[PDB]
RNA sequence: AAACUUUCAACAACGGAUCUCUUGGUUCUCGCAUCGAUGAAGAACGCAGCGAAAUGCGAUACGUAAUGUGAAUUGCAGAAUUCCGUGAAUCAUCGAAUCUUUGAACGCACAUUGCGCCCCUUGGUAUUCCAGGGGGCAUGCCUGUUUGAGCGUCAUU
RNA sequence: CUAUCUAGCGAAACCACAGCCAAGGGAACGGGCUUGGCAGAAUCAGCGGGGAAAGAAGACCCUGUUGAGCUUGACUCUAGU
RNA sequence: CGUGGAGGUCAGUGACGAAGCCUAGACCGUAAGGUCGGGUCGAACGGCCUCUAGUGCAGAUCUUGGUGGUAGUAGCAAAUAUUCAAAUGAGAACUUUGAAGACUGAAGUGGGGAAAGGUUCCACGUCAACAGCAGUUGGACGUGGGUUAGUCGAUCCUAAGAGAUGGGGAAGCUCCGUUUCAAAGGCCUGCAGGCCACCAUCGAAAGGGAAUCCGGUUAAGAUUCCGGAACCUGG
RNA sequence: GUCGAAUUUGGGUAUAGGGGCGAAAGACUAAUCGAACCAUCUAGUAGCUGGUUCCUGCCGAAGUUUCCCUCAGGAUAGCAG
RNA sequence: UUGACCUCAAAUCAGGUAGGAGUACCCGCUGAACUUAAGCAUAUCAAUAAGCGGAGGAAAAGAAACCAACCGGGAUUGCCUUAGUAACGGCGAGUGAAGCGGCAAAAGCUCAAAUUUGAAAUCUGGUACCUUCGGUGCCCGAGUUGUAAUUUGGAGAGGGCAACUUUGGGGCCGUUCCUUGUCUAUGUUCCUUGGAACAGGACGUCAUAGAGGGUGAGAAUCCCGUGUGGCGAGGAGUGCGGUUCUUUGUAAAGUGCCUUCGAAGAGUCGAGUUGUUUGGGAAUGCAGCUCUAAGUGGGUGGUAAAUUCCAUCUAAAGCUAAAUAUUGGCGAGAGACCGAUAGCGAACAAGUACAGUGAUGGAAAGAUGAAAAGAACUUUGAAAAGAGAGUGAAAAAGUACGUGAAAUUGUUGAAAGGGAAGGGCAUUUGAUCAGACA
């Protein structure tokens, strides 16, 4: 009904909503699950650091044409510019895209710099068994900041 | 104060388990402590109870009395002892039922398995 | 009904055995709660529907 | 969600000389003809049945939360408010109480307890060891049988065995300076706990 | 007590059949005695002895058949593993690991490498 | 004045409120993924020494075997051929078997305890009849095997 | 044969509390209220004036922005043809 | 003010008696209500500062349960009718036996069965409950016993009719049809011979239908048992 | 009233709910029929009827306007806190 | 005549498989109304409930015929926000998304279209043997109306030149994870009460154990257990480690530059119309019918049509874990919940008893005591029973049993009473009662 001077509402509760209501009491339990998942994945991982490299990006439309963002993949162009190939890169902790054609020279340069840095910065075990045998990190979200 | 998540301090589950439990586990729940002498001997304090052991009492109206197990009754969580009998008005002798935790052992109806268990538990 | 299915008669023997009182040795069992049968049947009062 | 609703009861109407709540149909059973769906009926549906989407948890401004902790901490240094709850702080060498950081390295409850009696928390630890009482409500069959008082709070910076040495002594709580739970600092919303600081913690507060 | 299968498993089919026949005879006589007298629970033991005997006999035939179909393609359906229906169908380890040759080459050329990020 | 009516207390009755209890319910979070023609779920019937049910099992019938524990069960009797044993218990565990008649249900039927057919074997003189035992007989689809039809169709006698 | 009295058995409807009347006034017909008449335990069989007696949230009537059945050159559609 | 429950606190009360209940005994409070004393009872409970709510009943022809006046009342009155004596037993209007009278009067209150019922049928014991009184009796209670088939029926045949199959429609559970646009088999003599074919199946304890009667027997069964005499089918 | 035919009846069989049957009454369709029974949607909605639980204190109304398929109801103003 | 082929059949042929159940969640299909609109038909409820099909442990979706128009991003799914917005609508009630951005979780890829043509190199089955989730040989068979190798558009193939780079399958033990089992402290000392001490007091002891439970009443120290550690059993397995053998191999991959090129899914796309659905508006998607394409092309670019540019993808074939869902099933752990007229309908022989032809409906019902020690024996009576006696802490606990309320009823006691009772003020009378001092 209508009553005294009040702003007008639009509350969409005419539709058997009570049957379909999700609450998050598992807000904590799922956090536990996720921490446990990450830790366990890492534990089995053979120290590959739980996230693959992702590239620096020019952040679409106007509201965010300013920002710079972590995208998906590194443009085969920039890969072979660094001096390697997509397939070997994927075996390495790297993430590669075929879309996102490079059109901006500085971003080309930046990503190739990232890749060269990372290549110089990591240590790969032989195809055989014996190695320096470990030390784990779980970043690559952070050690190559954006 | 528990730390193991797999355990529960639920009153209901506890009492439930204790009542529904089988003869196997009741064998342990009817465990009893030992005399000072036997404790000095074997470096151990308590055991599951069995038949034909000797025993003395430390509590209850029948405190101080002694005897041997006539029969275990895991279906009532109790014990039955010679030399321990109520005389009804009809004069019938009837055994009294006892919780072993309120007793003390003086002898052991010993067995291969019993001795093996004894050496098994040590007494850390 | 004097010309009756054997299935029927099977059920007759079943009900005949199911209509009785308790054996009394049960009432002396440890931790009993069963003083009398609660499922008895008498043809005068209530029926089987076969 | 289905309670009081498992029935198929529909009203007999009026003209049968009875109230027009919905009645159970059928026959041959005591429930036949009995009142149904309703808060006032037996076997019915309570008024405004309890829902899970009640608001259970409350968002509080973080600054306000920190404010309260700061007030509690400041109240820790007031012997009147600690006495006022019945913390046993009558003798007290001096307040706020600060102890060497070597206490963080204790592994045994016995050694720690002996230290505690020497500093003079014996009477408070007896306040707990004598306050164990049964609970008066229905909590006893909801896994809350025993009630007792709340004892002192030991504040450490680094744990090197003390928390496990103290997890079994009744009434005593432990905390790290970083965390400092208000629930421990102001139990029952009554201000001034008997807090025992360590030297490292007392330094780290700044 | 009565009889024991570990004593019986050393015997043959014929001795076992005779044993079983004797047990059934005795059981019949015990049924006669059961109405002559109010109660007779010695009959339980011979009842369970029959069960044990039949179990052993069944075992002998079954294991004979098993060693007969030892390492044959089609075993009998009552002798295959029961695991569950959906599994008795589902793929084998072989079929699951079957892989095309292109994918084999890519896996061998570029498998996932062990790497670490410090220096 | 009794009786009778009415009120109040005690005591006793009808009744099962209250209080205390609780091997239950409810709600939340976690963890897992496993029905079935290799015959499920469900049903009916029957099974114990002494049981009606519940529970459990299926003619091996409150269960069999193997494993672990290691001397019970229990209302009564019976056991104990033991109790330093390959060995008690309604124990636990469970990987090997039994698994009535049914049921998707599969020889055909099904208000029927109804009527048939094939193989092997056994009794009666029996290839032919009767009976007993044992094993088998659904449909659709696929892969293939064999036999096959079609002036559909090829080559040659 | 009942009712009636007895042996034994043994319900029900209904029940604000209850049960003598007049007049007044009153929701304009009171068992109660005001003023008067009166007023003695416990009662039995019948009795059918009153208890605006009980039976039934009125079936007539009006309403409801409640319905249903039926009809129809009402509004709107429709299987069909 | 008060109820349930939670945090805190009275190093709170308590089996030398907790809460709970009764108390024309008392006290405080305007009051909501609180306290105390006595009796009963037997295991947990309270005061204070806060929190929280499925939170305080006279009603709703409210719900569940229970008890009352009505009332030892209404009333137990159709079907012609009972009576005497014995035995029994604690006890007999009603049980049994016996004797009298009386009925139904074969279109029966008889005897037999189908449907349906399910052990009620029968024996012994037995009356707490039911038999609207009674109760020594019982279609009750308790425990047991008892239902015998080549010839009776079912089983078979088909009727009205239902209902698979091939097929067709249907998104689909399924619907239609049962001389169906089907490549629908079995009869004799491993095979050569040879002839035929709308070929599901279910559907009647009254229809059609192979054949049995006697006499005897039980507490309760019989064309089923016994004795005897026959018949039919198949081989 | 009828009592030898349009009779009566058992058993089997067919017809199912906006459907069935109907020597036609809107009759019958399991004590249910101007639309069966069971469950569900469904706690359907209801401007209408009834009910709505402890104290004390302080304050203290309206039944009028205007518009409404509006006249047993709402909004708005007014009275009140 | 003989032998093939194509097609279609049969067989209790050899071997296989589908059915049904369950169904909380999932993919679909079909598909309402009450209701709301203060009426009502559109609209809403609702693309819901009911009905039907079919799966899994997660499903489904997913590697762009995308979002966009920025300096552009870059599979999908979910959270936050976008937003109660743009939009829809008797523009009334109402409904109502998507991009961007942040986070979670992460993973890519295969078929077709190509001459193996100096050699079907492919595959099922049968059969002997074997180191058997499989393998060698042989045979039969399928198959060119096309199985293998290559390539999947991010490209890529063919040739030419030029070098460079790298590989594998085993056993072995250990480790990991499950199934699990086992060992892992502390008084039952004295006194009080009590039937029992698990209460009180004193005296102690352990504590990475004071959580919980049982035990004749509130038990850290009586028992289980708790906690912390240890020792094993059986299994899965390849994650990890370590060993130890072969040697793939004259075979596979990758890498450069020149050159020729470079196949790319049709009764589909698209359009019209009809119906429905959508926020989707000259038409969001879907389906029916009618029309029906092209290869510097096609789809889209949220106002229809014509014209010219631009931009972004590349359909009509396909696979893919995790994040996410889950009143079901199984195993756990918890609660400011209910506490026997409550809480699941069911704390118990409850979906039971019982009703109904049937579908369906659907109950009520907990508590002796520490232990039956469940009342021996006597007496009256036919007996039930009573009275005794007797156990028990209590029989005011005697199987109708914890406590045991009220209505209601009996006895006793007190009191009143002329057609009601009850109540306020006041007081007598009666019965009873507290309270003051040394």
Short mmCIF file of N, CA, C and O in Angstrom, two decimals, chain A residues 98-129:
data_model
loop_
_atom_site.label_atom_id
_atom_site.label_comp_id
_atom_site.label_asym_id
_atom_site.label_seq_id
_atom_site.Cartn_x
_atom_site.Cartn_y
_atom_site.Cartn_z
N UNK A 98 47.34 -16.30 -27.84
CA UNK A 98 47.47 -16.08 -29.27
C UNK A 98 46.65 -14.89 -29.71
O UNK A 98 46.94 -14.28 -30.74
N UNK A 99 45.64 -14.55 -28.93
CA UNK A 99 44.93 -13.30 -29.10
C UNK A 99 45.79 -12.20 -28.52
O UNK A 99 46.96 -12.41 -28.16
N UNK A 100 45.22 -11.01 -28.41
CA UNK A 100 45.95 -9.85 -27.94
C UNK A 100 47.16 -9.60 -28.81
O UNK A 100 48.30 -9.80 -28.38
N UNK A 101 46.93 -9.23 -30.05
CA UNK A 101 48.05 -8.95 -30.92
C UNK A 101 48.77 -7.70 -30.43
O UNK A 101 48.16 -6.69 -30.10
N UNK A 102 50.09 -7.80 -30.37
CA UNK A 102 50.92 -6.68 -29.93
C UNK A 102 50.75 -5.56 -30.95
O UNK A 102 50.92 -5.77 -32.15
N UNK A 103 50.41 -4.38 -30.46
CA UNK A 103 50.36 -3.19 -31.28
C UNK A 103 51.09 -2.01 -30.66
O UNK A 103 51.18 -0.96 -31.31
N UNK A 104 51.62 -2.16 -29.45
CA UNK A 104 52.20 -1.05 -28.70
C UNK A 104 53.62 -1.42 -28.29
O UNK A 104 53.83 -2.36 -27.51
N UNK A 105 54.58 -0.65 -28.79
CA UNK A 105 55.97 -1.05 -28.74
C UNK A 105 56.46 -1.17 -27.31
O UNK A 105 57.22 -2.08 -26.97
N UNK A 106 56.04 -0.24 -26.45
CA UNK A 106 56.53 -0.27 -25.08
C UNK A 106 56.02 -1.50 -24.34
O UNK A 106 56.71 -2.04 -23.48
N UNK A 107 54.82 -1.96 -24.67
CA UNK A 107 54.30 -3.13 -24.00
C UNK A 107 55.02 -4.35 -24.50
O UNK A 107 55.32 -5.27 -23.73
N UNK A 108 55.26 -4.39 -25.81
CA UNK A 108 56.17 -5.38 -26.39
C UNK A 108 57.45 -5.46 -25.57
O UNK A 108 57.83 -6.52 -25.06
N UNK A 109 58.07 -4.30 -25.37
CA UNK A 109 59.36 -4.23 -24.70
C UNK A 109 59.25 -4.69 -23.26
O UNK A 109 60.08 -5.47 -22.77
N UNK A 110 58.22 -4.22 -22.57
CA UNK A 110 58.02 -4.55 -21.17
C UNK A 110 57.86 -6.03 -20.97
O UNK A 110 58.49 -6.61 -20.08
N UNK A 111 57.02 -6.66 -21.78
CA UNK A 111 56.80 -8.08 -21.60
C UNK A 111 58.04 -8.87 -21.94
O UNK A 111 58.35 -9.86 -21.26
N UNK A 112 58.78 -8.46 -22.96
CA UNK A 112 59.99 -9.21 -23.29
C UNK A 112 61.00 -9.05 -22.17
O UNK A 112 61.76 -9.98 -21.85
N UNK A 113 61.00 -7.89 -21.54
CA UNK A 113 61.87 -7.67 -20.39
C UNK A 113 61.48 -8.59 -19.25
O UNK A 113 62.36 -9.19 -18.62
N UNK A 114 60.19 -8.69 -18.97
CA UNK A 114 59.70 -9.62 -17.96
C UNK A 114 60.20 -11.02 -18.25
O UNK A 114 60.69 -11.72 -17.36
N UNK A 115 60.07 -11.43 -19.50
CA UNK A 115 60.37 -12.80 -19.86
C UNK A 115 61.85 -13.08 -19.73
O UNK A 115 62.25 -14.14 -19.25
N UNK A 116 62.68 -12.13 -20.15
CA UNK A 116 64.12 -12.31 -20.04
C UNK A 116 64.54 -12.34 -18.59
O UNK A 116 65.38 -13.15 -18.18
N UNK A 117 63.96 -11.44 -17.79
CA UNK A 117 64.20 -11.43 -16.36
C UNK A 117 63.88 -12.78 -15.76
O UNK A 117 64.70 -13.36 -15.05
N UNK A 118 62.71 -13.30 -16.07
CA UNK A 118 62.24 -14.56 -15.51
C UNK A 118 63.13 -15.71 -15.95
O UNK A 118 63.49 -16.58 -15.14
N UNK A 119 63.51 -15.71 -17.22
CA UNK A 119 64.39 -16.74 -17.75
C UNK A 119 65.72 -16.74 -17.02
O UNK A 119 66.24 -17.79 -16.63
N UNK A 120 66.29 -15.55 -16.80
CA UNK A 120 67.54 -15.44 -16.06
C UNK A 120 67.34 -15.77 -14.59
O UNK A 120 68.28 -16.18 -13.91
N UNK A 121 66.13 -15.59 -14.09
CA UNK A 121 65.84 -15.60 -12.68
C UNK A 121 65.49 -16.97 -12.14
O UNK A 121 65.55 -17.18 -10.93
N UNK A 122 65.12 -17.91 -13.01
CA UNK A 122 64.68 -19.22 -12.57
C UNK A 122 65.80 -20.22 -12.76
O UNK A 122 66.85 -19.92 -13.34
N UNK A 123 65.56 -21.42 -12.26
CA UNK A 123 66.53 -22.50 -12.27
C UNK A 123 65.78 -23.78 -12.56
O UNK A 123 64.86 -24.15 -11.82
N UNK A 124 66.12 -24.42 -13.67
CA UNK A 124 65.41 -25.60 -14.14
C UNK A 124 66.22 -26.83 -13.80
O UNK A 124 67.46 -26.83 -13.89
N UNK A 125 65.53 -27.88 -13.43
CA UNK A 125 66.18 -29.14 -13.13
C UNK A 125 66.46 -29.86 -14.44
O UNK A 125 65.80 -29.59 -15.44
N UNK A 126 67.41 -30.79 -14.47
CA UNK A 126 67.65 -31.53 -15.70
C UNK A 126 66.47 -32.42 -16.03
O UNK A 126 65.58 -32.67 -15.21
N UNK A 127 66.46 -32.91 -17.26
CA UNK A 127 65.51 -33.93 -17.63
C UNK A 127 65.75 -35.23 -16.89
O UNK A 127 64.83 -36.03 -16.75
N UNK A 128 66.97 -35.44 -16.40
CA UNK A 128 67.27 -36.59 -15.56
C UNK A 128 66.75 -36.31 -14.15
O UNK A 128 66.03 -35.33 -13.91
N UNK A 129 67.13 -37.15 -13.20
CA UNK A 129 66.54 -37.10 -11.88
C UNK A 129 67.20 -36.15 -10.90
O UNK A 129 66.50 -35.46 -10.15
#
